[PDB]
Design a protein around this ligand. Structure first.
Ligand SMILES: Cc1c(C)c2c(c(C)c1O)CC[C@](C)(CCC[C@@H](C)CCC[C@@H](C)CCCC(C)C)O2
Ligand SMILES: Cc1c(C)c2c(c(C)c1O)CC[C@](C)(CCC[C@@H](C)CCC[C@@H](C)CCCC(C)C)O2
Lengths: 121, 121
């Protein structure tokens, strides 16, 4: 759920999840996807597409278990959807971290409207 | 949906929705409710409870139409859930605007652990 997602982002990026990624670009935050503004945003884009593949679980509300082992997010077995979900979240946190270098605060509270329609996943 | 909600909030408050309300207090933006920290936060609490009352539609995903008439958000739905949904949104947008006077930036990104259990809707 958003709690694990937030925590992962926090863990990987060291940044307050909500502040930095709760609303960034066309893809990080609420409101589906949009043409990504940058790498960071693309992480969220990929992340939302990742969520699209899920079936059987609520990416937002369903909590799941994962562990921080050797400073790596390790998804708990949970169940297939939750594990996949967890993997989606883990991927985006990793991705956001990898792209922290080009994080651009100007995209922080980007207005969802000024986002080009995203390509289908 | 959040698209209309966000637009309403911007329209009423004149503030970037994600920036001011994406994560404010215990109820604005954050997942779930919490004892409101203040009036602004209470708006979101009320809004979330309003959402809980809806039966035939998805408050997050379902789009509905509304118009801006005489600088008033005018829901344009007859479907009861979409109408109610729209009204929930309109109400929080108005409420957020009516409470900008006690809006406090220190509640932005308020840490969930500080939130006390919300009263039941
Ligand atoms: C409706 C909706 C929202 C609002 C949303 C997303 C999706 C898919 C949705 O359908 C995806 C990403 C994000 C951008 C989430 C980003 C951050 C949050 C999950 C914050 C979690 C915060 C907690 C744990 C701890 C970290 C903060 C430290 C200060 C302790 O917000
Ligand atoms: C899951 C969930 C979320 C995430 C939520 C709330 C509730 C009740 C929920 O159950 C209430 C308020 C808020 C904090 C509001 C956040 C605002 C976003 C909806 C904004 C998107 C803003 C865009 C469109 C505005 C610009 C458009 C122009 C056309 C005017 O977020």
């Amino acid at each position: 759920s958003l709690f694990e997602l937030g925590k992962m982002i926090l863990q990987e990026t060291g940044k307050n999840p909500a502040k930095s990624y709760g609303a960034y670009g066309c893809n990080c935050g609420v409101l589906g996807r949009g043409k990504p503004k940058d790498a960071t945003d693309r992480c969220c884009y990929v992340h939302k597409c990742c969520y699209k593949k899920l079936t059987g679980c609520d990416p937002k509300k369903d909590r799941y278990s994962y562990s921080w082992k050797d400073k790596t997010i390790v998804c708990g077995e949970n169940n297939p959807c939750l594990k996949e979900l967890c993997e989606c979240d883990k991927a985006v946190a990793i991705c956001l971290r990898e792209n922290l270098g080009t994080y651009n605060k100007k995209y922080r509270y980007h207005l969802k409207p000024f986002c080009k329609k995203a390509d289908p996943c």
